[model samples]
Target: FNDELRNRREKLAALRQQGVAFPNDFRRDHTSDQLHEEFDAKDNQELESLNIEVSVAGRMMTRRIMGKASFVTLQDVGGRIQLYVARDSLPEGVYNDQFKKWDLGDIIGARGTLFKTQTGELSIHCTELRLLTKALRPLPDQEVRYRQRYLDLIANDKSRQTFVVRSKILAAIRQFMVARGFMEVETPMMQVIPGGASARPFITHHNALDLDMYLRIAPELYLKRLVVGGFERVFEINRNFRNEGISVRHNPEFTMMELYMAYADYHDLIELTESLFRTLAQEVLGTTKVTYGEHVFDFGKPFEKLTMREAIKKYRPETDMADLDNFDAAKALAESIGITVEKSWGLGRIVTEIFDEVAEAHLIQPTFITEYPAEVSPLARRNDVNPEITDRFEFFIGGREIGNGFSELNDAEDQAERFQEQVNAKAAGDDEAMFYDEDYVTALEYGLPPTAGLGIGIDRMIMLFTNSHTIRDVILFPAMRP
Candidate 1:
């Protein structure tokens, strides 16, 4: 391995002295897929008569030699093509002196006629060949794949397919939103106050202003302001930076599609999400149902709905629902289940803790867990029948929450009250707490109409659709520890 490494450097040096080690003038008239789709069915006799002369360029992936005649596999972005380099066919000394010494990972160019081999594989017979670029460093092991991503794309076909599907999924989502009368909008990534979500934010100093600015955890507050200003329906699909722990299901900076509809409610958002998922599956993967890990999820059917308390009772049938109705009672049940209840957590938060510990992971199908507590949903409208709970829902599948939606807390006074409560929570030693934004409340005081908002985690959705095992597998370059 050392000799090969040293010898390749020597070979590159030899190339450097010959004027230009890397040439850029060679043009490719055809790609691998173009040739395959156009000529795979054509018989060799027909191809010869047609004389399909084409120029191709790509990295050499596989090479086989049996004497004067040899076969090489070239992989371009579109796909792979076989090159037949016979000694007698090429000019003298070009094969022995130039082509034979070429390394396996080097970029090469070929000008040839397309034909099928005797074994019935479409190929090219090279009339001219050139070394286009030099890969000085040889490809290495699996850990090298993440550090140098180009080599991963070159060697692994499945890795490339995952990203290809990711693009299609995103494209379908944008098209789906536009077709349904929604306009895309952009909002501030850095904010004076991170008021939208209950998550600690990454902060940095704004030097000129001499003030601290925080990266936004969600676009909820700004999007609500747009609604107050009369944008009936708007959505933003972008990155959010949360100073949070990393896991298989979490990333510090991840993408989300946050949308607000001026006249809709939580139920509408639920229906919209179902249709969006079903459409994505059909358009991107060519099916209505997708396999995630051990189970199959059917997005075409209506998702099952359950109230937060109902889910807990269903999963933990041995417990009485009355135990969760009172603050001390709920706290006692939570502790019995091995959860240490915090001081700020009231009966509402205690009930949710019980749900998280006992019921969340048991939701294996496409289910909608609704009626979240108003204590946890600071930006949500409260339920009329049960003032303690908000009209909110979290969509889950394969035992993971993928999206959340709720009716907006449109009343300016109520919003201000929630923000104050969040400030109190932050002072009480909770890192994940929102800051009070006076300007946002002022905008809302102008009177916001009835509206609903939904946020879908795009990275987690990609994980499910692509069958990727971890957040890092779907993400191109996730954050790594130094």
Candidate 2:
């Protein structure tokens, strides 16, 4: 069967190469859904009921030939339509050989009258049909649809619907931010130090400078610099890179939405983030509830807010902070939590380890885990009440931390100290630690207003809203290992 189909395709290609206008240019009068919507079902027999001329383009997914009459399914960005084509209805020779030659995956345009078929399905009865582009490959049938996604999207109804929802989610996010006076900005993807977050960065060399640069692990630092430069509310929604493991939740390069609001603290950002999430969820999902992997997430109400220490204690009550106040106790906790403890381990490192081990996985709902240990929050300001922790909060949903935000550490002296501590950590074998940037410290010394900042995982949010279990499902083309 396959061999015979290949031979037929080769014959068609030969004819196409000889210039029969293999891909024709014909304008569509209207979209499949538009025609259905504007034309009332009551006026079924009226030819003038739907009188709009619209143009659309999409791949041909299904075709059923029946001698003088045929039925074919055309899939477009909006939706799909069943086209009823008759040899007698079109110009002579149009349907006889040309229509038969049109195969699955071919892009086509058609002018047709709106009508309901005997099966009570909304269909287009074609008056004019033209092949716009022919596909070299045949789309897979239902059996292999999901396993073969490229073909599945071509053949299955659910795949197409999911993609549409994904697009809508992205559009809503951009609209929400832009409507709120947030100035969209872009920063250098390549930088001298990947200091925004605590993650190993993907490194590369610049031949001309004879120096190395790192793909930004986060845009947090740069966005705040813009805050220093006096752009009060700035945001960046694009790609960030990290030399990390790939899993259902992780990717080496992923989309991030980072924003900074000057003259605000962590509390202000918390409210903003909450409202944004609820608004986007309602706009895209049509409700505040989202379903993911056997769990339902309701963002309609206020999100659960808890401190990091309280959350950790819920998992391991024995992890007391009173006796274990210093770096020595922090080091022991690291070993207990299955994290490798080094001689230079600090309180922040141990707290992060404990959270990663006991608390991170259990957070399957929308929860705001706040007040992270100060050592890990290198770019965030130390809490005024207690210097041990920074005013930071990470959003957790579906057992994954999707975004992080905190009050920035704008104090020049403190910022310098944090950078120096990062240098110490790096010297002590923490390659992910950031280096002190004298230029950034200088910028802070110029007196930046107190600000709050955030970084949201755009791809992960898309995955959540679209009901896509894997990150790759939402990304058109994700990086893959050979």
Candidate 3:
């Protein structure tokens, strides 16, 4: 081993020989950030006169020793602060034998008076120092830094700040929902029949029951069932597992904020969605404008609304809207645009494929693309005038789908028919197809109201608000290959 690592281990061994190597008895009175914010402007004379003493504990980040005195940087969750320790100020053996031998990354406690250095850096003039815990190994490189997030938070300030903001983001979302009379709820993670959305499910066998169950792909079905039972307005912000491919935008397990409101439609949800984003930006970020890469999204203004047919026509002008309803024509357009469509795909599926390829990427700003094809929106209510289209809309920002909402299908017969279609699709080799759930159909027979359900991708929302490019950046301890 190198001299630095060897010395660190030897010191650890010596610390172990001591009666208490990692002590938890020490209590801290202030965080590093709290001290700095409250005392950064205080002159040395003012600090001395105030006689401000505090107990602070954190990881020792940087240290420079000059014989008997040292200037060290301590990092806590809030922030970092400097500490000035002198041999005479601390107990005799504590300085020469213990403090001087301490390594970086060791957790330490300091009891001290607040003061400013000659250079005017606010610092702790520590009279007592206690070793709390020793970090045996040095932090690894960037690759391992992500794989080991605890080390990443210790070694990288930006990473630490990112997660801090992420917490605030979640808090703001909950506050917004509660203020609007939406009761936050939790549903089963493992479902007997996963019928929420169209996505491949991760299955696990329940050993005692001798049954195979699946992790929920979305909480939509259950949340809507609550609406049926008269919860009126309910929301869930939790994890959903999908057996899917990983990318900058996709993960095996991800966070989703799904809510259902009684007596609301797709239009009502569009306004609610706009309000939620604006409120989140204003509350968490203190602004309605956020930048995600090259693009800036302004949540202050009204989000643009467009129909799927209009979006396809706007992006691919040569295509006719009527052609979208024709299977052969839509398939031809999809293939012409390099999107492969299977022969089993219905006309609605072909139109969706065409829209996805031709129009989705151009939606850089906040937009609601409405009137999704009925076949692709099995759980969504069909349009009154147009039977082939559903009252569904997907909200997009930064060229990606961030949220989806629709007037939920409440007719039991219609729901059963849609479920059968999904089952047929599954039988025909589409692993991502939804399974038929007789229970959910039976619940609809008890009558679900004219409810509107919406789901927002929480990770992707954080990515936009925090200016994080990849979904992995916002998700702490993201899935990684072994």
Every model: Cα RMSD to truth: 1.3, 2.8, 1.4
lDDT of each: 0.89, 0.80, 0.88
Off by over 4 Å in 3: 139-142
lDDT digits (tens) for residues 250-282 of candidate 2: 778898888888888989888987898899888
Ranking by lDDT: 1, 3, 2
Q: How many Å off is the CA of 388 in candidate 3?
A: 0.8
Q: What's the lDDT for residue 480 in model 1?
A: 67
TM-score versus the correct structure, for each prediction: 0.97, 0.91, 0.97
TM-score of predicted structure 2 = 0.91
lDDT of 3 by residue, 1-482 (tens): 38878878888788788687777899999998888889888899999999999999998988999988999999887788899989999988889988987888888999989999899898989999989998786644555766888877787777888888899999999988999899999999999988788888889999999999999888888898899899999999999998787866678999999998999998999999999999988888888888769888899899999998899999989887777767778777778889878755788888888888889999999999999989899999999999889999999998999999999999999999998998898888777788888888999999899999999999988988888888877889888878
List model 1 lDDT by residue over 1-482, tens digit each. Answer: 88888989999999999889988999999999999999999999999999989999998888898889899999998999999998888888889998999988899999889999998899999989989887776654544666667767777898899888899888899999999999999999988888677787899999999989989899888998899888989999999998778766677999999999988899999989999999999888888889988989988899999998889989999998899878888888999999999877678788888999899999988899999998899989999998888999999887888899999998889989988988898788777877889999999889899999999989889989989867777877777655
